[PDB]
Amino acid sequence: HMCDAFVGTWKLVSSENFDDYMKEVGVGFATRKVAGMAKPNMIISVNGDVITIKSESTFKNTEISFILGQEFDEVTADDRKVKSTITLDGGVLVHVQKWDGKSTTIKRKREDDKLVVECVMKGVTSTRVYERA
Ligand SMILES: Nc1nc2ccc(F)cc2s1
């Protein structure tokens, strides 16, 4: 019942500072422009200990499945090959990606009827808000 409140189909409704976050990550111009336009749907489901987060947009379809605390390979939407670990910390899903000696953390939490996604790369934060589809 660990992630019950995250389960469902979610649609992006707002984004702040995402271009600056992507710059900090190292995303190139053309990908930042196209990816910044996208309004992904995120589909979250749980089956036993396995959590799946699928994202569908006009830019890319991506999918991760994982067990909390157990590192996995992820190819990100911007084509980074990263090593990811996702844990629950006080009800917040905390997703750390490591690649090329770099690190970024993505936190997902329920706030009212929203699912709020905070993406941090060094000093730069972007906030992306999803509502139920
Ligand atoms: N499947 C996905 N499409 C996008 C589009 C933009 C983005 F920032 C993340 C994702 S994941």
Documented resolution in Å: 1.3
Domain that holds residue 124: 4-129
Evaluate: CB of 99 within 6 angstroms of ligand 1: no
Secondary structure E strands in the chain: 8-16, 41-47, 50-56, 61-66, 72-75, 81-89, 92-99, 102-111, 114-121, 124-132
Determine the Cα–Cα distance for residues 97 and 31; give it in Å rounded to an integer. 19
User: Residue 123: which CATH number?
Assistant: 2.40.128.20
Q: Binding site for a fatty acid: which residues?
A: 128-130
Single out the residue of 69, 73, 74, 72 nearest to residue 55, CA to CA.
Answer: 74
Domains contained in the chain, number: 1
Q: How far is the CA of 35 from the centre of ligand 1 (A)?
A: 6
Evaluate: CB of 54 within 6 angstroms of ligand 1: no
Evaluate: CB of 14 within 6 angstroms of ligand 1: no
